[PDB]
Design a protein around this ligand. Sequence first.
Ligand SMILES: [Cl-]
Length: 261
Amino acid sequence: KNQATHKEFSQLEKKFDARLGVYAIDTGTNQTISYRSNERFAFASTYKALAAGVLLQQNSIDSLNEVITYTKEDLVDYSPVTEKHVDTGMKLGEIAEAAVRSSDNTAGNILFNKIGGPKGYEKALRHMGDRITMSDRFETELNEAIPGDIRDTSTAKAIATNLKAFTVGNALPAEKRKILTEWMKGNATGDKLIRAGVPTDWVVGDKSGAGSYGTRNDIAIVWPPNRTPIIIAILSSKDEKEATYDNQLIAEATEVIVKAL
Ligand SMILES: [Cl-]
């Protein structure tokens, strides 16, 4: 379906007035599905699932019970969990969970901090052989997504390969790989995205993203019934800075991958 899937993906770009980037790999058959998979998009909040994976590589399960504190002036826009616990701090595991499950932006910034900032995040991905992802800024400036500006960008193929390493591969011991996938499962932020485009007997652990220039992303590990997982990265963006986005574009792209695999 090399050219057959190309046509369907090209058709979605027109129906939703957007640019689409797709990479999916069936971990059981190593069959891949790709479209503009080497083009750069701003990754926006999808980094949070990978940064949680780096955090888990670098810290014990025990240490996730350690309390982390921060200040009111550390709070950035859209921090619906962290804004409630300024006076007490949160457990480190709770912060990582807030970043993955709710896309809490202060929690994302703490994750960054704990793994050495954007530069430390990038260095961890380079260690896993990701040469493509470029991390430069904290929330919320990392969402600026200026076309042609490679700060805080990656490709569908690079992001999917990283997610594969953390969730099914050998980037984490089993127990932490399980902690990560559970954080990624059952979150409402994912409900209209890849989860809305797979059949109802499939299970989806995802991480969604949204940025300026209509940037709208979802990355996932998905389990068909009785079947090895498929890793999916779907990226989208537009040409106008204040452009809106349409969840349905991600869901329709997912339907195309499902039919092809
Ligand atoms: Cl304070």
